[model samples]
Each structure stands twice: as C-alpha cells, then as structure tokens.
Target: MGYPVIVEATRSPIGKRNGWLSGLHATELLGAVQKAVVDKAGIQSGLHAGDVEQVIGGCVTQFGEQSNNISRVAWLTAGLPEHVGATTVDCQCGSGQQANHLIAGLIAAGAIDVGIACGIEAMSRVGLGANAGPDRSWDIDLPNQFEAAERIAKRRGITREDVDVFGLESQRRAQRAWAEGRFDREISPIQAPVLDEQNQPTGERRLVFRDQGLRETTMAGLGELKPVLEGGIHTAGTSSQISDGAAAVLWMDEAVARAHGLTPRARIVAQALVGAEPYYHLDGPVQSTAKVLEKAGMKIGDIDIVEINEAFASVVLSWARVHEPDMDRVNVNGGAIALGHPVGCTGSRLITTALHELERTDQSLALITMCAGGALSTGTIIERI
Candidate 1:
C-alpha cells in the first residue's frame, strides 16, 4: 500500500460569529476553500481539479443552505469536475479531522490515489444544536458541554486563575504569531461578499485575510467576567468562541505524488478515535493520545508539537494534568480561545496549523487532536518531510 502524504493544507481566516465572514453562504465559503486547495495542488504537482478522486468533508449542522450533501454541491458550485464524488461527515466537533482520516484511509486502501479531506461550519448562518429533533425514550440524564467542562475543572483541581492565565497566554501567543507572520502561509484569503442591511448582496466584495477572534485581553479583564454557569469555574474568556470557517487538506499516495514531481509536505503517520465517559464529553483526548502514540511507537515526549483543541480551558488543563507534556510545545501559537472554533472546520484547521508549525520550527513530528460530542475524540500525528 502506498503511504498517504499531505500535498497541500489550507484554511480560510476564522470569523467570529456573525462577523467578518458572515455574509457568504456556506456553499460559497466552502467552495472557495475547496477550490483554493486544489488550485495550490495544481500549481505544485500539476494535479487538476478533475484528477481528485473524492472529496470527504466535515460539517455539523446540515439544514437549509448547508444541507443536500453540501460537499458535492460545493464542488459543483466551484465548477469543478462533474464526475468526482464527495462525502460529508458529522463527528460533531471532531468531524473535520475524522474526514481527514477517511480520505487517508481510502488512499491507504488503494481505493483512491488522491482526495481532499476538508471541513466547514458557517455558524453565523446555522447555529449549533440547530434543527435536530431527538425523541428517544427515557434514558440517562443528558448533560451539556459547559457543565462537563466545569466538572472536569473541579475534578482536576484547576482553579479559575489557572484557566484565565491560560486563556490570556493564548491571546498573547496568537498576537505574537501574527506579528511574526507565522499564520501568513497557512491561511487562504477569502473573497467575501458585502451585504446590505436587508441581507441582500451588494455585488461588492472584500478579501478576508486574518482571524477576527483575537482580543486585546488581560487577566484583569477575564477576572471581571462571569462564568457561563452561575457557580462554574469557566468563563467566556476560557471557552471556545463561536466562529465560521473552512479548511482543507490535499492527500495523495506518496509514490504517486513523487511520480507527479510533487514533494510531499508531511506524512500521516498515525490516527486514533476513541470514546470516553459520555457525560464528561471532553476527556477522550487522554485515551486517544495514548492509543495514537502506541500506534506510532512513540511517546508523548517524541511529539515535537501539539494542537489540542481548547473547547474549554479545563479540557486542555485537565489533559495537561494527566499526560504532562511540555506546555511550550503545545498550541505554541494559541488555539480556539484565540483563533475561534468553527466546529466541523476546526479539525482540519488544527491539522493545517500543525503541518505549518512543524515545517516552520523544523520539527519532525506533530500531534493534533480534538474532543467531540458523544464522548469521543480524534487524534492524528503527522511527520514533516
């Protein structure tokens, strides 16, 4: 079997809820990213959009404009090949990364030589927990994510100050990264349609080049904010921001890529998906990380960089208390707290960021992981070439 290698990785600038990227339809926003990734691949390997065998994308809310197999629709919306097929997945928060795994699996299984693993969520257009009707019979008490994160903090003995400082560092690091142009290469500029007060397109457009979630934050400011729960440890400052965005990763069989005169950027070394205690909703990273490392025949110290989603501060803080990897090596450029979390889009976003950081820092290996709904997580390890 040929090895699965990354040919291109890209993401649109993350926009805060109803912010910079709010006006565009999900089809247009996702279509633009899909086109850009393939365009980059064509520039590098002479791979045409028609040569893509499949598109496996992640999307959470699938109603209204985002429904009707958005992956397939977006491909055609970009005027790509008519023959290539697409699939959209829903792993909740981990949906994007799970899509990556599917594409890589197909390549490894020789079912396809090239494919795009992508993800998108235009939360401004469709809110989370939207349009889902659940009528299951009496079962266990259903708990929300906020309470689960709060519980994790209490169980881990993570203080509010701990999370607040962690969040502040996320903002500072993100600011420094932008100043140093660390994200310049990873982000793809998106052409956004300007809208009128009535939500009508005005035919004017602007290029969105940077994430809109970064705040000029301080500990004092965070201290003044109240927790989402009346007596919980977490506040908005320590939680993932509502956002909109899309991300894509182009993958191909290594030998096939070399034959096409393409230099693989990174190799998908190992991947993991695991279930945790359902009610807790976030701790699966601990199990996923352990399993992924075991598959890679490496230890936590062997990973040169890490991108664990900050769905909540306690999510990262609790994971840290367990595995104890170097904080400096984890989310070195910040995370969802500073970058925003576009659910389905964040999985691929994290993967794209990890690949770029590994190359920037000249590191060999990087681990990217995120928690999802249904008490699960996804873990992926990439080795820079």
Candidate 2:
C-alpha cells in the first residue's frame, strides 16, 4: 500500500474559552483552516468540492449547542458543494486523531482519492461537560471516566510538588518554544476582535493564542485553587487548559500528488488505536503507543520524537517515568499543559505539529498519541519523506 502523504496541514491559533474565538461559530472557524490547506495544495481538477468523495471530522460535544453534524455544515458553509458526504467521530479526547487514522486507511486502500481529516472544539460555547449523552451509555462501565488526574494522584502517589514542578516545566518550555518561533510555521494566528461589555466587536483585532497557559505558581497558590474533580489531586494549574480551536490536514496518494506536481511532506508509517483500563483516561497513550510500536516493528527507543497529549501534567510525567522517553525529545517544545487543549482538535493538531517539527528539525520519525475518554487512545508514526 502507498503511504498516505500529508499534503498540507494548518490550524487556527487556540483561543481560551470566552477569549478569542468565543463568539465565532465553531464550524466557521474550523472551515477556514480546512479551506486554507486545500487552497494551498492547489488541487483544482477532478477533486473539486463536488467530486471529493468523503469528509471525516471530530467534535466531542454534539449536544444542544453544537448538536448538528458540524463537520458537514462547515463543508456546506465553505461552499464546498452541498452534496459532499461527511461524518463526525467521537472517541472523546482522541476524536481528532481517530479521524486522521480513518482517513489514512481510506487513502491506503484506494477507497478515496482525496479526503480530509479535521477536528473542532469550541468549549466556551459547547462546554466540555456537554459531551455526556445517551448514545455513550455503552461505555458506562469503563474506569476511564474516573477522572485521570485523580487516578494518577491516587495510583502513583504523586504529591502537589510533583504536579507543580511538571506544570512549571511545561510553561517554561512553551515560552521557549514561542520565543524560538517553533509555532511560527504551524499556527495561523487568529485575528480575534476585542469585545465590549455588550458583546459588541471593538474594531480591534489581536492574536488570541499568543502565550501558553504558564503561570507563576507557589505552593500557596495551588493550595487555593481546587482540584478538577472531587478528591482529585490534579488542580487547574497542572491540568490541560480548556480552550477553543480547529485543525485540519489534507491527504492524497503519492501518485496523485506527483500528478499535481505537489511534493509529499511526510508519509503515514503506522497508526494504532488501543484501549486501556477505563479508570485512567490519560493512560491511553501507554497502551496505544505499545500497539503502534508493535505494529511498526519499532521500539520505544527507536522513536526520535514523541508528542503525548497532556490531559494532565501527571499523565505525561507518569509515562516518562515508566517508558523513560527522552524528556528533551518528548514534547520537545511544550504540550497541552502550556498550550490550550481544544479536546476534539488536539489529537490531529499533534499530528500536524509532529510532522512539521520533523520537517523543520530534519528528523526522521515521530510518534503521536493522545489519551481520550472511555479509556482509549490513538497512536501514529510518521516519517519525513
């Protein structure tokens, strides 16, 4: 099978809840990035919006506020032919990553010549807790719903100091990443209009996701803030930031790209979706990573770089202790702890970042994984072509 090349990838700057992208429609914001990447690829013949075969996207919350199939709606709103087919995948936190894996199969099997994998989450409007619905009753018995942060604290016996140190490192690394212009290549800075008290636009546009979620935290400050859930040790400062944003990547076969005179950026090496004990949602990466490594016939040491989703500072910290991943190479710049975590979009966003990081630094292989709700995760390996 031909490798599914990442023709192009792009993402909007992540905005904090009620911060930058708070007032805009989720679909509209995500569609902008999707359209941008497609336009960059210059695929004008045989694969116009009308001829495109399928579209797959991820959004965690599809209740009241974001009830409709926002994926299809976004495509229609983009004027990409109303008849285009679309579907939404919800593997909770791993929604976006799963979308990418699915599309990779489509491209490898020759099921579709052109496809898009994207993720959207506007938590300010839809809210994170909005995800619980009747259709999710099947996984009711899973332990992953127990809140990962709390489980980490209970299981590993991590103290507040451990969490504090991890959070500080994440913030410091993120600031350095921004200073070094790591994100300059990946982020499409969002021009967020300032709002007045009445929610009126103030005629001024500012970069919404300029800084990471780093903060000067004393033991006292953490003592004051409450943990995420009851009896949970993970506090707001150490956990992933709640925010809003969208990300997208376009895929096509090598021949198709060569036919279009487009250079392939990277090839999808291997991808695996795995399950773990439901009690700890953040641990999905541990199991998922093993599966992907097994499938790729690569070991943990063979991976040149890694991007493990930071559901909580403890999650990655714990994985690091167990797997002994090079901290320098792992999350080389920063992760969700410092950057905003837009649940549905984060997984795919990791892929986009990993691929580009490899290209920018001239690395060969990278691993991308994210722990999701329902005790699941999606892991993928990419090689710079």
Candidate 3:
C-alpha cells in the first residue's frame, strides 16, 4: 500500500446540551468544519476544491436534519464544488474514525489523491436513541448505556472509587489543557446563534471558541452523586456528556502532498475494527487496539500517545487493567467526561486532538480508539512526521 498522510486536522468547540451550539443544524456544524479544513489547506499549500477527490463523513443518527447524506449536503453548503464525490458512514460512535480509516485506505490504494474525512453530531437536537426506529420492531433491545457501563464495571471488578478517580482526572486534565492552551492549535472557532427566552433567534450571536461542558468538581462531589442505575457505579459525573460538535481531517497521498509543498503532520500506519460481547459493548476498544497494534508490529509500550475515548470512567479503567499502559500517557489532555462526547464527532475529534498533542509534545506514534454503540470499536495508529 502507498503512504497516506494527514495534512490538516481541526474541530469545532464541543458544546454542552442546549448550549452554545444547540441552535445550529447538523449540516451547518459539519459544513463549517469541512470548509475550515479546506480553506486552511488552501492557504498553506494552494490546495483547492479540484484537488479533493472525495469527502467521507460519519454520522450516527440518520434522521431528521441529519439524514439524506448530510456529508454531501455539508460540502455543498460550504460552496465547494459539487463535482467532488461524497459518502457517509455510520459505525455508531465510531463512525467518524471509520470515515478516516476508509479515506486513508482509498488514498493509499491510489483511488484518490486527496480527501476529507469528518464527523458531526448535534445530540442536543437529535438526541440519543432517536434512531431506534418508529415501531421498535426487530430491535436488538441492547441494554441501556448505563446498564452496559455498570456491567463492564462489575465484570472487571472496578470499584466506584476507581471510576470516580478516573472521572476526576479527566476533569483536571481538561481544565489544565485549556489553561495551557493545548487545544488552541486544532480548535476552529464558530459564531453560534443566540436564542431568546422563547427559543427564537435574537439576531445576536456568541463566539463558541472553547469547550462548554467543563466545570469545577471535586472527588467528594463526584462520589456524592447518585448512580444512573441502581447498584451502578456510574453517575453523570463519570459518563460521557451529550453534546454537539464536528471535526474534520484532510488526507492526501504522500506524493501529492510533497508535490504541493504541503508538509504532512502524520502518516496513517494501521487501522482495525472489531466486535466484542454485545452486552458489554465498551470492551470493543481494547479488542480493536490489540488487533491494530499487532498489525502495526508494535506493542502497547511503543505507542507514544493514546486516545481511548472516555465513554465512561470504567471503560478506560478496564482497558487500562488489561493493557497495563502508563495512565499518564493515556488521554493526557482529558477526554469525553470533561470535554464532552458528541458521539459521531468524537472519533475524528480524538484523531484531531491526538495529532496536535503529538506534535506539541514531539511524540512519534499515536493510537486513537473508541467504543461504539453496538458492541463495535475502531482503532487507528498514526506516526507523526
């Protein structure tokens, strides 16, 4: 396979439920991120719409405003050329990461020279479980997310304290990362519409330039919260937040990038997707990571940076126990608990954040992984250039 490289990575500031981004449609959020990447690359290396061969976007809820292939709609909304091809993928929460994997593989196969992979989720509007179908017939009836998380905790022998500490660390890291300007390198600020008391646009606006879900909390505070389910260890404090956000990454064949004088930020090394026990869906990340690392001929210790989406505190803690990675190197800048998890957007969001973090710290290799909604997970490993 030929080399595929990342030329640009960027994302919108994650917004809390009914927060700054709540007013925007899913297409608008996705469009802004896609346009930002294209415009930024154009400025840097004269990359233009004609150079883009395809656009692949990930979205989970394919209903209401998010349906009818929003990936193509978003590209058109950005005033980009309609001739460029577009496709949308839905791998649940891993959709965005799967999009990146597909685009990179296409470039590596010489089927495309340049492409954009993105993810968008407006959970504030679409809401989780909206895609469960109207009649609920033929449904798998998977356990609720909280129940699934609790099951994982119990199976792994994780305690409430273990999970609470994990959540606390996530909050602290996110706060410190923001204070230190760690996210500035990849964040693309957006002007969100302001709404009045009656839910009508006021023609006023607010710049959503930073994540809106973060807040101060102590271990004691977290411990005092009631579990989402009876006999459960997870609380709102330890679970991923419902939020709105979008992220995108530009990929190109290494030769095309060199011809355009665009320095690649990283090279796609390997990618994997795996299925685990459906009842305990969160374990997908660990299984996917094992497969990916094996293909890359690297061990857990060889990974310089790791982004395991913190869907729940126990998810990360369980993976940690099995892999034995240095916790310090995992999600070092924080994760979904503090920064918010916009489901479909999070895969590419994690990739964007991991790439920037690797560059900032001069790390060489990074592993990005996430657990999806349907007992599935995706993993991608990239080497910094």
Candidate 4:
C-alpha cells in the first residue's frame, strides 16, 4: 500500500475560549487555514475552490455557532467554488485525525486523487455539550458521583494530582518551545477579532500565535485548585482547554505530491487505530503508537519526536513512563496545557506542528498520536523529507 504523503500542513493558531477569535464565525477562521494548505501544496490549477472531488472534515461541537456543516461552509466561504462535495465527521476529539485516516483510505483506494482533510472546533461559541446526544453508553440512572469522568478516572487509577502534574509539564514544555521559535512553521498568524464586554467586536484585530492556555501552572497551584465537582481530578488547569481553531492537511498520493514539485513535509509511514482498555480512554494512544512502530518494523528508539496529544498531561506522561521515550525529544515545546486543545482541530494541528518541528530541528522520523473522547487513539508515524 502506498503511504499518504503530506504535501503541506497549515492551521490558525489556537485562540482561547471567548478570546480574540470569539467574534468571528468559525467558517471565517477555518477558510484561511484551508487556503493556506492548498496554496502550500502547490495545487494551483485543476483543483480550485469548486474543482476538488470531496472535502472530508471533522467538528466536535457542531451546534449553535459551530453547527450546519461548518467544514462545508468554511470551504465555500473561502470562495473555493461550489461544485466540490463537502462532508464533516464527528468522532469526538479524534475528529480531524480520523478524517485524515478516511482521506488517506480514499486516496489509497483510488476513490479520490486529491482532497482536503480538515477539522475545527469553536467551543467558545458552541459551548460544551450544547448539542450532546444521549447514547445508551451512559445510563442516565447513575448518580453524579458515578458519572462518566469519575468512572473513567476510577478505572484508570488516575488521581487528582496526576492531572495537575500533567498540566504543569505541558505548560512548561509549550513555553520552552515558543521561546525557541519551534512553532514558527505550520502556524499561520491569526488576526482574531477581539470582542468587547458586551460580546461585540471591538473593530480591532489581535494577532495570536502562541497558545493562550498556558499560564503559570505550577504543581503547587494545580494542587490547590478545587476538584471539578466532587472527588474529581479534572479542572480548568488539568483538563484540555475549550478552545477554537482550524487545521487542514493537503494530502495526495506519494507519487502525486512528489510529481507536483511540492516540498514534502512528511510521509505517513504507518497509522494504527485500536481498541484499548476503557476508563483510560487515553490508553489507546500507547497501544496505537506501538502498533505503528510494529507495522513499520521499527522500535520506539527509532522515533525522533513524539507529539502525543496533551488531552491530559498524565496521558503523555503515562506513555513516557511506560515507553521511556527520550524526555528531551518528546513535546519539545509544550502541549495542550500551553497550546490549548481545540478538540476536533487538535489532531491535524498536532500533525502540522510535529512536521514543522521536525523540519526546524532536522529530525528524521516523528510520531503523532492523540487520545480521543472515547477510549480510542489514532497514531501516525511520519518521515521528514
């Protein structure tokens, strides 16, 4: 099977909830990212706004401000054309990553030659769970104490402090990365519309490149924050931020990207999506990483960089504790703690960040992985050109 080659990756810098980007519509922000990806990929002729075969994207909170096929709206709003097909996938937090997987499958099967795999989340406007649909997975009969977060935490043996420490490290790394200019690439400086106290635009734009979520998170400070609800470790600090952003990956067959004279950022070596133990819905990341390495006939030691989603700090730490990854190489700058997690957009953003990081440091092989809402993960091993 031919590996999917990343011709280029682009995204808007993540903005905090109700921050600079809260004033503009989600499609407005996402369109810019998609445009950048297409331009960087050097697809100038046959595929314009309306000429592409299909657009597969993901958005988690597609309700209220974020609903009504935001991906399609973004693609069209960018003035790409109306003839191409558009679709959105909602796989919780794994939306974009899984969308990439779907796009790759389409390319490999010759069902489509060129497409854009993108994702977005405007939690600032969507609000959490505004569009939540109850599935039998969680029986409504359970008391609040026995609810989802508690049950999952109990099963994984993850504690309050576990989440806090994760937050601290993620912030520290993100700060370091930003200082070193590691994230300069793949990040399009976004000029967000700053809103006023009354939720109206201030007629001014704020350029946001660094993630706003990282704020002096210390072990001591995290320890002091009150538990979310009762006996829960998750909090504003430890949990992934409810943020807004968009990411788009320009993908083509290995031969196609190369023939187009586009600079190859990275080529997908292997990808693994697996079932792992529940409770640690995040546990699948570790298992999926191993699967990618095994499939590529490589070992953990061969990986030069690791971009495990900072869904929670401990999630990456747990994998590190188990895999013993090179402490200096993994998440060199920061993660969700510092960068902010834009739910569906994060997977592609991480992949975009990982590729740019590798290019900046001249690293060879990088691993991009994420732990989604459910106990699932999608792992991709990429080789830099």
Candidate 5:
C-alpha cells in the first residue's frame, strides 16, 4: 500500500473571540491558510497550483458566513485552479483532523498524489450554538457545555483543585513555549485589516503573528472564580476558550514527495474515530486513543508525544488517568486552555503543531486526539519520517 506523507504544514495564529481575527470571514481565514500550505510546499519542491488534486476542509458551524460549501468557496477564494476538487467535513470538534485523515486514506489507496487538508472557524461571528436546531423532544433537555463538564468532573471524581491546577499548568506551559519559540516554525503570520464600528476595514493593517489567548494565571486566581454551573467544578478559566483561526497541511504520496525533492516530515500511521455517551462529550478521547493505538499495534507508552485537546480541564486530566501516559510528553507546549480552541480549526492545528514539534524534539511517534461536541472523537498517529 502506498503511504501518505506530510511535506508541509502551517496555521494562522489563533485569535481570541472578538479579538484580532474577528473581522475576517471564514472563507478569508480558511483560504489564506489553504494558500499558505501550497505556497510553502512550492518553496520546498516544485509544487504548482495544479499539482493539488483536491482540497478537504473542516468547519463546525455551517451557517451564515460559513455556509454554501465553505471548502469549495475557500478554494475559489484563494484563486486556485477550478479543476481541483474540494470537500467539507464536520465531525464536531474533530472535523479538521478528520479532513487530514480522509485525505491520507485517499493517498494510501493510490487515489491521488497531492492534496491539501485544512480547517477554519470564525466563532466570533457565527457564535457557538448558531444554526444548530434545538432538540425539542420530551426525552431530553440538552444540557449546555458547562453542565457536561460538571458531569464529567463528578463522574470521574475530578476536583476543582485538580482542574484548576491543570488550567494553571496549561498557562505556564504556553508561556514557556512562547518564550522558547516552540511555535515559531508552524505559525504563519497573517496581515489582518483593522475594522471600524461599521465593520468596514480601515486603511491600516495589523500583523497578527502570535496567539492572542495566553494569560497569566495562578491557582489562587482560578480558585477565586465561581464555577459556571451551580456547585460545579469548572470555571471559565478551566474550559476551552472560543476563538477564531485556520490551519492547513500539504500531503502527498511518499514517492511523489521524493520525486519532487521534498522531505517528508511525518507519515500517517493510523487513524480512528469513535462515538461515546453524548452527555459525556469530552470523554471520547479515551476510547478514540485506545482504538487508534490498537489499530497501530502500539501501546500508550510507545507514543512519544500526545496532543489531547483541552476542551475542558477535566478532559485531559481524565484521559491521563485512564491512559497512564507520560504527562511530560503530553501537550508539552500547552493546549486549548491557554492557546484557545478554534473548534473546527484545532484538529489540523494539532497536526501542524505536532509534526513540527516532533521534528524539533526528535521524537519518532506522536498521537493527536480531540473530543468533539457530538460525543465523538478522532485520533491519529503520525511517525516522523
């Protein structure tokens, strides 16, 4: 079987909700990153716009500014060739990573030589619960995300102190990562236009070159905040922040990459997606990780690096309790709590960051996993090649 290799990856700096990236539409953000991966690949090899056979995009909210098949729209918005195919996917929070997984599977099956997998979310504009029809059944009153987080904490015996420390650690790690320049390689600086009250762009522009969500927090500060739910453990600081961003990865058959004088950074080893109890939405990572690791014939110890999305502080802490992995290697550069979670954008964002960090740390195997909103999660294993 032919193997799919990742030759290039890049992501726009994540922006807090209503922050630096709020003015851009989903098409603009998604298209910019899509174009960036192609351009970056071209610099490494003689890759042309026509060389790409398809573009797979992941987005969560598919209404208003994000509707009308945003993947195809982004492809055209980027001025790419019309002949190239495009697809959009939504696996809840795992949509972006799922895009990469699907494209890699296509390549492994000899379907195409070159393609791009990307994800984008403009949560600041569309809002989280937007366009989602509410469930009116008498059988269920859908609890909000805060309620879900509280349930997980209570079920898993995770205390507020535990989650608070997790959040604090996330902030510390992110600050250290920035101070150490860990994210410098994967971030593609974006020249975003400033907007006035009328939502029209001003003549001035600002370069958004770094993540805008990092904050200095101590256990005391986290402890002082009241829980989002009554008597619940989760506070605003312990949950994933809503944000805006986009990311992309350029993938090709190993032979094609070698033929074009491109160096493969990583190879997709195995991928898996699984469903869990809907009420415990954030617990999907545990099952997804086990499924993927078993599929890859590897054990938890074999994974040198792990990026478990910090949807809530308990999400990562609970998974760690079950998996018994080396916490040192997990989210070494912090995660969604500190860097912000751009929902649809995080999957490919994890891939982009993991591959680069694997190279930076000389690690051989990496596992990227995320819990999705629909009680679904996706996990992928990549080996530095």
Candidate 6:
C-alpha cells in the first residue's frame, strides 16, 4: 500500500452563526482556508499549488451558495490551478474526516500523489436541513440528534448536571487554551467581510483571529436552562453550538513529500468508518474507536491525546463510559460544546488541532473521532513525526 502524509493543516477560527464569518459566502470561507494551506506550505517547503492533483471537501446541507460542487468553486476562487479536479462529499458531520479518508485512499491506490482534503459549514448561511431529503420515516423509528442525545444519556446513565459539568469544563479548557495561546499556531486568521445590522455586507472587513463561541458560563446559569425535549437530560448549555468555519489539510505520498523537501508532520496510521445502532444515532463513535484500535493492534491506553467531537456532552460521555479513556488526555483544549461545531468543518479541525497538539507537547500518537448523522461514526489515529 502507498503511504499518505500530511504536509500542512490549517483552519479558520470558528464563528458563531451570523457572526464574523457570516458575511462571507460558503465558497469564500473555504477558499481562504485552502489557499492558506497551499501558500503556507510553499513558504515552508517547496510545494507548488499546481502540483496538487485534487481538492476534496466536505459540507452538509449542500444548497444555494454551498451547492453545485463547492470544492471546485472554492478551489478556483482561491486562484488555484484550473486543471486540478475537485470533489465535494457529504457524510454529515463526518464529511470532513471522511474526505481525508477518500484522499488517503486515492493516494494509497496511486490515483493521486498530492491532494487537499477540506471541509466547511457556513451554518450562518446554509442553515441545517436546507437540502434534507425525506427519510424512511413512514416505516422506521428515527430520532433527531437532540432526542438521540437524550436517549444516549439515559442509556449511559448520564445526568443533566453531569453533562452540565462537562460542558462547563469544555468552556474553561477552551478559555485556558486561548489564554495560554495554545490555538494561535493552528488558526489561519481570515479577513471576513463585516456584516451590518441587517446581516448584509457593510463594505468592510475584519480579521477573525479567534473562535467566537466562548462566553461567560457557570453551573448555576447552565442549571437554569430547559431540556431540549421532555424528560431529556440535555440543555442548550450541554449541546454543541451551531457555527461557521472551514479547514484544510495538505496531503501527499510520503516519498513525494520528501522529494519536495517537505518533512511530513503526521499520517493517518489507522482509520475506521462504521455504521452503528441507528436508533440511538450517537453510539457509533465508540464502535468506530474500537474498530480503528483493533485494526491498528492497539489499546485505548496507547492513545496520548484524543479529540472526540462533543456534538452533545452525552456523546463524549457515552464514549468515555465504554472506553474508559483518561479524562485529562481527551479534548484537553476543549471541543464543539465550547469552541463550536461547524458541522463538516469539525472533522478536519480535529485532525488539525490534534496534529498541532502533538507537536506542541511532543506527543507521538493521537486519536481523533466524531459522531455524525445516520448513526455513523469515524475514528482516525494519527502518528506525528
């Protein structure tokens, strides 16, 4: 099998819905992230943007500004090579992570020597369920993410207060990480068009250098929130925030990276994508983690850092209930509940954050995982140089 390596990873700090990034179109948001990867790698190494064979990106709710092969539009909008091909994929929340899996498969099969795996979610504009097609709801029992989260919480014996505590910790960690400047290196600051009171462009631009989700919170405040569903354990405080952003990863075969005078930072050592119990919807993350670890012949203890998307606090808590990973080692820099989940953008952002975390702390192995819609999950283990 051929080897695929990461040359550079970049991401825009997530923006709240209708916040800083809202003024930019979806293609515009992704274009900036993609260009940063190419330009940064060019300066750090000798990579030419034209050498990239493909740009594969992920996005959910593909409609309006986000539709019609968004990766192609974003790639070209960045003034990249017109000859390079593009693909836009949707695996719901795992869309971004899964795009990298596709890119890695392409490289391993010799289909392409270099490619960019990226993702975006301008929830500020695209809005969830914009392109949602009707499902088998007539004959099947299906639940939305909120209900599934509540179900998972009940099944896993998680309490409302328990989830609130976790949510608060996520915020505190994110605040600490920001205060300590932990996120400075990975955030590819972008100039987002400023929006007016009516949410239209104001002929102005502002540099979005930090995530916009962090806010004042306390257990008392969180306790005052109402449950999303009747008799549910989740509240707005414990759920992932809807946000906007884009992220990209620069990938090439290991040999090609060396030939280009670029030192590969990390590579996906093992990846697993699986469909778990659909009714619960959020159960697949642990199953995916199990599959990936088994494929790599490793154990949970072998992971030095873990990035599990906190779609809801219950999602992470449920996975922890099964795997029993060290709480301190997982999501050390906070997660979706704190920094905001840009849906598709989060999958690649996890990889980007984990890769940078490994380098910052001198760790060798990291595990990144997330739960998506369709009761699916993705597990990826990366090894840093």
Each candidate's lDDT (Cα)?
A: 0.91, 0.78, 0.90, 0.76, 0.89, 0.91
Clashing pairs in 1: none
Candidate 5 lDDT over residue span 1-385, tens digit each: 6679999999999998888888787888888888888888899658887899988989999888888878889888878888999999988899999999999988988999888999989998787768767757556643456777777787789999999989898899999999999999899888777777787888877989889989979888898998888888888888889999999999999988998898888988889888977777678899999999999999999999999999898888889889999989999999999999998899999999899899998989999999888788899999998
Model 4 vs truth, CA RMSD: 3.4
Deviating ranges (above 4 Å) for candidate 1: 133-138, 196-203
RMSD of each: 1.6, 3.2, 1.6, 3.4, 1.7, 1.6
**Cα-based TM-score, every candidate:** 0.97, 0.90, 0.97, 0.88, 0.96, 0.97
Highest lDDT against the true fold, candidate: 6
Q: What is the TM-score of candidate 4?
A: 0.88
Residue 283, candidate 5: C-alpha displacement in angstroms: 0.5
- Name the lDDT of candidate 4: 0.76
Q: After superposition, which runs of candidate 3 have C-alpha atoms over 4 Å from their true positions? A: 136-141
Q: Residue 51 lDDT in model 2?
A: 43
Residues 1-385, candidate 4, lDDT per residue (tens digit)? 4446777788888888987677668888887787777766555434344335677888887886567887788878888767777788887777888778888888888777677889888778777668876855773232231244455566557678776766777788787777877777777877778889999877888787766666877788877887666766677676667788889888777676566555556777888777765645565677888889989999889999888877665566667766778877787777776788888898888888888888887989988888766567788888887
Candidate 2, poorest ten consecutive residues by summed lDDT: 43-52
Check candidate 2 and list the clashing pairs. Answer: 143-278, 143-279, 144-278, 144-279
Candidate 2: residue 230 lDDT (0-100): 70
lDDT of 4 at 154: 61
Give the clashing pairs for model 4.
49-80, 50-80, 166-313, 173-333, 173-334, 174-333, 174-334, 177-333, 281-375
Look at candidate 5 and give me any clashing residue pairs: none
lDDT of 1 by residue, 1-385 (tens): 8689999999999998978789888988899999999887788557898889999999989887778889998999988898998999987889999999999999999999999999999999988767586866547853588988988888799999999999999999999999899999989999998777787788988899999999899999999999999999788889989999999999999899999988889987899888887767788798889889999999999999999999999999999998899999999999999999999899999999999999898999999989888888999998999
The deviation in Å at residue 176 for candidate 4 is 1.8
